[PDB]
């Protein structure tokens, strides 16, 4: 579909006291790939990232408009942004284009700015929020990542098992996926530090 014009696959998974977001690396037109370095995970403040999947135009455009409104909010008020606030902001921005819709499925993954409470949520192409506790996925491939995460997820996970679980899920679901592949980037964040690893994915 139009969601499968440039591909895309974003997974975010809630751990015990930490949260891990991962995406694919491929960018290209319908079957002809172009590059492997296309960024889909953005830093929106500290210890809180957003992921975007779908049409890459809307990806970059929504990321820049969100950055615009985010900077204006954080300069009117000296504190940084809470995750629910960002979720409502993204929902409002998408629902402004109720009938000229952007083709994207944002995924917000971040921590509490006061406590170490993890948070995950996803949104639809018109601004439907959905908070859960285990994992959210987006992009062209869905059912693969649903099957893997419903296979492997446990409730209370140290960051290493969290990292390995999201690793196996992304690798298997992307290797079964066709139009989205060519590498994995993994952000595993927590209260203390931010880690960014890339996996040896199959370049096929």
């Amino acid at each position: 579909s139009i969601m499968s014009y440039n591909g895309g696959a974003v997974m975010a998974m809630k751990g015990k006291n930490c949260v891990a977001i991962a995406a694919d690396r491929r960018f290209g037109i319908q079957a002809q790939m172009v590059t492997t370095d296309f960024q889909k995970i953005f830093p929106m403040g500290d210890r809180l990232y957003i992921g975007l999947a779908g049409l890459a135009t809307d990806v970059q455009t929504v990321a820049q408009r969100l950055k615009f409104r985010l900077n204006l909010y954080e300069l009117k008020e000296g504190r940084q942004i809470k995750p629910y606030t960002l979720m409502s902001m993204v929902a409002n921005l998408l629902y402004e284009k109720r009938f000229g819709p952007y083709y994207t499925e944002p995924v917000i993954a971040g921590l509490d700015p006061k406590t170490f409470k993890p948070f995950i949520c996803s949104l639809d192409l018109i601004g439907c929020p959905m908070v859960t506790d285990d994992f959210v996925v987006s992009g062209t491939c869905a059912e693969q990542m649903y099957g893997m995460c419903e296979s492997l997820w446990e409730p209370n996970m140290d960051p290493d098992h969290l990292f390995e679980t999201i690793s196996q899920a992304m690798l298997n679901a992307v290797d079964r996926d066709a139009v989205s592949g060519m590498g994995v980037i993994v952000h595993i964040i927590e209260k203390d530090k931010i880690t960014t690893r890339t996996l040896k994915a199959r370049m096929d």
Binding site: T35, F38, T57, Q60
Partner: protein
Amino acid sequence: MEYLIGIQGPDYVLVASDRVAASNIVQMKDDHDKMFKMSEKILLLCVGEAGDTVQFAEYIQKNVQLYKMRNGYELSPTAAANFTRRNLADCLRSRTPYHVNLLLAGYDEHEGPALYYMDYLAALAKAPFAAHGYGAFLTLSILDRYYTPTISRERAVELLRKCLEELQKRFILNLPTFSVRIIDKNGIHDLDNISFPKQ
């Protein structure tokens, strides 16, 4: 249809257009020029619907000249790339959308050489070498066969001549003469025009 290829080096960007301005049966103009010298270190190529290409030349060329005359210092290539992407993304959803295919060649004093890649759906890309049309396919194969990031410029000219000799053997188009530029620490240096007698 036609294609204008651009390669990234250590300190140079090797772009190469064509000179074909055909309309649906016949080659009307055999010495067309698709190279838009925006500033002293920033090139621009354009492919698409030819009523739109001239007006992108107008808009972007004259507007970046406006920036230069206003402030006092030449743009970075990255800001120019984003400015073009923003203008396409704005003109996309309207009653008048623009359907072109760009790729940007620049060189900063601090960032060094840079090569970008547009689309008719306005996606930025930071690539080592690009593709549009069908010259896309039959260049990208060999060009991804032979690449080294630490490649000297005469090796790149040799690779490009070899790639063109592979082009002029399995197309269905004509493509006789290809104009070629290069960007260095100095500026836009025109190389010799690269045509080929086939048989």
